[PDB]
Design an enzyme around this catalytic site. Structure first.
Site, PDB file in Angstrom:
ATOM      1  N   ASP A  29       1.781  16.890  -3.083  1.00 58.01           N
ATOM      2  CA  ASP A  29       2.325  17.871  -2.276  1.00 58.01           C
ATOM      3  C   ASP A  29       3.141  18.947  -3.382  1.00 58.01           C
ATOM      4  O   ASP A  29       4.060  19.662  -3.122  1.00 58.01           O
ATOM      5  CB  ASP A  29       3.387  17.736  -1.344  1.00 58.01           C
ATOM      6  CG  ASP A  29       3.523  18.805  -0.152  1.00 58.01           C
ATOM      7  OD1 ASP A  29       2.818  19.635   0.057  1.00 58.01           O
ATOM      8  OD2 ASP A  29       4.677  18.949   0.365  1.00 58.01           O
ATOM      9  N   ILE A  74      23.964  24.945  -0.174  1.00 60.19           N
ATOM     10  CA  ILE A  74      22.910  25.495  -0.659  1.00 60.19           C
ATOM     11  C   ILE A  74      21.599  25.955   0.345  1.00 60.19           C
ATOM     12  O   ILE A  74      21.239  27.144   0.516  1.00 60.19           O
ATOM     13  CB  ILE A  74      22.119  24.548  -1.758  1.00 60.19           C
ATOM     14  CG1 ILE A  74      23.218  24.600  -2.987  1.00 60.19           C
ATOM     15  CG2 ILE A  74      20.701  25.362  -2.082  1.00 60.19           C
ATOM     16  CD1 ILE A  74      22.582  23.439  -4.054  1.00 60.19           C
ATOM     17  N   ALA A 133      15.075  18.374   4.090  1.00 60.46           N
ATOM     18  CA  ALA A 133      14.132  18.023   5.383  1.00 60.46           C
ATOM     19  C   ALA A 133      14.927  17.240   6.246  1.00 60.46           C
ATOM     20  O   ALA A 133      14.609  17.256   7.656  1.00 60.46           O
ATOM     21  CB  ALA A 133      13.028  17.448   4.903  1.00 60.46           C
ATOM     22  N   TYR A 134      15.932  16.393   6.015  1.00 53.79           N
ATOM     23  CA  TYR A 134      16.652  15.338   6.447  1.00 53.79           C
ATOM     24  C   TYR A 134      18.049  15.620   6.152  1.00 53.79           C
ATOM     25  O   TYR A 134      18.929  14.599   7.134  1.00 53.79           O
ATOM     26  CB  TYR A 134      16.260  14.039   5.906  1.00 53.79           C
ATOM     27  CG  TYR A 134      14.801  13.931   5.854  1.00 53.79           C
ATOM     28  CD1 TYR A 134      13.949  14.112   6.586  1.00 53.79           C
ATOM     29  CD2 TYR A 134      14.300  13.226   4.702  1.00 53.79           C
ATOM     30  CE1 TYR A 134      12.546  13.930   6.841  1.00 53.79           C
ATOM     31  CE2 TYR A 134      12.955  12.979   4.499  1.00 53.79           C
ATOM     32  CZ  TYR A 134      12.161  13.487   5.814  1.00 53.79           C
ATOM     33  OH  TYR A 134      10.727  12.977   5.523  1.00 53.79           O
TER      34      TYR A 134
HETATM   35  O1  LIG Z   1      15.431  21.006  -0.350  1.00 48.86           O
HETATM   36  C1  LIG Z   1      15.801  19.886  -0.912  1.00 48.86           C
HETATM   37  O2  LIG Z   1      15.257  18.707  -0.435  1.00 48.86           O
HETATM   38  C2  LIG Z   1      16.791  19.827  -2.101  1.00 48.86           C
HETATM   39  C3  LIG Z   1      16.485  20.887  -3.144  1.00 48.86           C
HETATM   40  C4  LIG Z   1      17.296  20.707  -4.452  1.00 48.86           C
HETATM   41  C5  LIG Z   1      18.035  21.842  -4.850  1.00 48.86           C
HETATM   42  C6  LIG Z   1      18.723  21.865  -5.983  1.00 48.86           C
HETATM   43  C7  LIG Z   1      18.769  20.664  -6.703  1.00 48.86           C
HETATM   44  O3  LIG Z   1      19.349  20.721  -7.882  1.00 48.86           O
HETATM   45  C8  LIG Z   1      18.078  19.538  -6.332  1.00 48.86           C
HETATM   46  O4  LIG Z   1      18.264  18.488  -7.246  1.00 48.86           O
HETATM   47  C9  LIG Z   1      17.439  19.631  -4.988  1.00 48.86           C
END
Ligand SMILES: O=C(O)/C=C/c1ccc(O)c(O)c1
EC number: 2.7.11.24
Length: 352
Positions: free
Chosen positions: A144, A26, A30-31
Site C-alpha cells: 500500500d 494531529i 484508522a483506529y
Molecule cells: O495517520 C496515522 O496513522 C499516523 C500518522 C503519523 C503522523 C506523524 C508521525 O510522526 C507518525 O509516526 C505517524
C-alpha cells in the site's frame, strides 16, 4: 485522565501515562486519533497513534501485522516503534498506543500545496527505494505504498509507514482470475492486479513507487481511476495497448480477451506528460511503470539507475538480517487469539 479534542472518530480519552504530556491533536489515523506529545524521558516531542482495534477482526489483523513487522525492522527510511502503551493484562486491554518519531508532514500533504524541485524529487525517490530495498530483502511486500504512507520531517528525512496490508512474498501463488477483488489503494495498483495477480510479488510495490514518482513530477495522481476497472483504463490510456508478447504472458482467457477487445491505443510519451521533468527521471519512470511485471525494474536496479547516481551507495543501503517467515495472513484465528497475540507482541515495552 488526559483528554484531547473530544467529538467523534474514537478519540475522547488519550491516556498515554505520565511519560507523555502536552498533547496536541494531529489527525485521524484508522483506529483512533493521532497526537503529538512531549516525551519526558527523551526530552523531545513524539507522535502517538491511539489504536482501538478490538471490535473488528480486520482491524486486529492489520494492527498485529504492522506491530510484528515494525518491531522487527530497523532502518532509517522506515518508521520505528519507540514505545507501546497498554494495560498490564489482557482483561484490561482495550486500547493500544503506538509511539513513534514525530514526522511533521507526509508526501500527500506536501504535494497538495508544494512544488518539488528536481533535487527534492531525486532525494525523496532515493529514500523510498532505499527503504524498499530493506523491506524486500526481508521477503516482505508493503502493498500500500502511496504519498500518505511516506512521512517526512522538517529536514526532508523520509520514512515509510503503514504495514497493515503487508504480506510475505509468494510468487509461486500469485496467480488468480480476472477482476479479482483487491484491498490496496486503487490509484497505486499495478495493472496485473485487475488481470491475473494477487499482489504477492515484489513488482507490485515497484509499480506503486512509479506512480509516486509521476505524482511528484506534476502534483497530480497519474492514474486516478474512479472505480475498479476504470483503473486499468487509466493505465492503458497512457502506456498504450500491450504488445503481443506482453499479452501472451497473460494466460487466463477472460483477462486476455478483455485486453484484446479494446481498441488500439498508442503510448503517450512521458516527456509530453511531464515536459519539465529530468530526462533521466523519465527513463527510470518508464522502467517502473512497465506493463509486464516480469520486465519491470527491481528495487536494486532502480537504485543503480543514472537518475540516482548522486546518492547510490550499495554499502550504505542495508538489508535485513534474515527473511520473515511468520504468518501474515492471520485469517484462521478467532478474536480471542488475535487479541492475545497483540498482547504478547507488545510485552517488551512493559515495566514488567
Ligand atoms: O495517520 C496515522 O496513522 C499516523 C500518522 C503519523 C503522523 C506523524 C508521525 O510522526 C507518525 O509516526 C505517524
Amino acid at each position: 485522565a488526559a483528554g484531547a479534542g473530544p467529538e467523534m472518530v474514537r478519540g475522547q480519552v488519550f491516556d498515554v501515562g505520565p511519560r507523555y504530556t502536552n498533547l496536541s491533536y494531529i489527525g485521524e489515523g484508522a483506529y483512533g486519533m493521532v497526537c503529538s506529545a512531549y516525551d519526558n524521558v527523551n526530552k523531545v516531542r513524539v507522535a502517538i497513534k491511539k489504536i482501538s482495534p478490538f471490535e473488528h477482526q480486520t482491524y486486529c489483523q492489520r494492527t498485529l501485522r504492522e506491530i510484528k513487522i515494525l518491531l522487527r525492522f530497523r532502518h532509517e527510511n522506515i518508521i520505528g516503534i519507540n514505545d507501546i502503551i497498554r494495560a498490564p493484562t489482557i482483561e484490561q486491554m482495550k486500547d493500544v498506543y503506538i509511539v513513534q518519531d514525530l514526522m511533521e508532514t507526509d508526501l500527500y500533504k506536501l504535494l497538495k500545496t508544494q512544488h518539488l524541485s528536481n533535487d527534492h524529487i531525486c532525494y525523496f525517490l532515493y529514500q523510498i527505494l532505499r527503504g524498499l530495498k530493506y523491506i524486500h530483502s526481508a521477503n516482505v511486500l508493503h502493498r500500500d505504498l502511496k504519498p500518505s504512507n511516506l512521512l517526512l520531517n522538517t529536514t526532508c528525512d523520509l520514512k515509510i509507514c503503514d504495514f497493515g496490508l503487508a504480506r510475505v512474498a509468494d510468487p509461486d501463488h500469485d496467480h488468480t482470475g480476472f477482476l479479482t477483488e483487491y484491498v490496496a489503494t486503487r490509484w497505486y495498483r499495478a495493472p496485473e492486479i485487475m488481470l491475473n495477480s494477487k499482489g504477492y510479488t515484489k513488482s507490485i510495490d515497484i509499480w506503486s513507487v512509479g506512480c509516486i514518482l509521476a505524482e511528484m513530477l506534476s502534483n497530480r495522481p497519474i492514474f486516478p481511476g474512479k472505480h475498479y476497472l476504470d483503473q486499468l483504463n487509466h493505465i492503458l490510456g497512457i502506456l498504450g495497448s500491450p504488445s503481443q508478447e506482453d499479452l501472451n504472458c497473460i494466460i487466463n482467457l477472460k483477462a486476455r480477451n478483455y485486453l484484446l477487445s479494446l481498441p488500439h491505443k498508442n503510448k503517450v510519451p512521458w516527456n509530453r506528460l511531464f515536459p519539465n521533468a529530468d530526462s533521466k527521471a523519465l527513463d527510470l519512470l518508464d522502467k517502473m511503470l512497465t506493463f509486464n511485471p516480469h520486465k519491470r525494474i527491481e528495487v536494486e536496479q532502480a537504485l543503480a539507475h543514472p537518475y540516482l547516481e548522486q546518492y547510490y551507495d550499495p554499502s550504505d543501503e542495508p538489508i535485513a538480517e534474515a527473511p520473515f517467515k511468520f504468518d501474515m495472513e492471520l485469517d484462521d484465528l478467532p478474536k480471542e487469539k488475535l487479541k492475545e497475540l497483540i498482547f504478547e507482541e507488545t510485552a517488551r515495552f512493559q515495566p514488567g
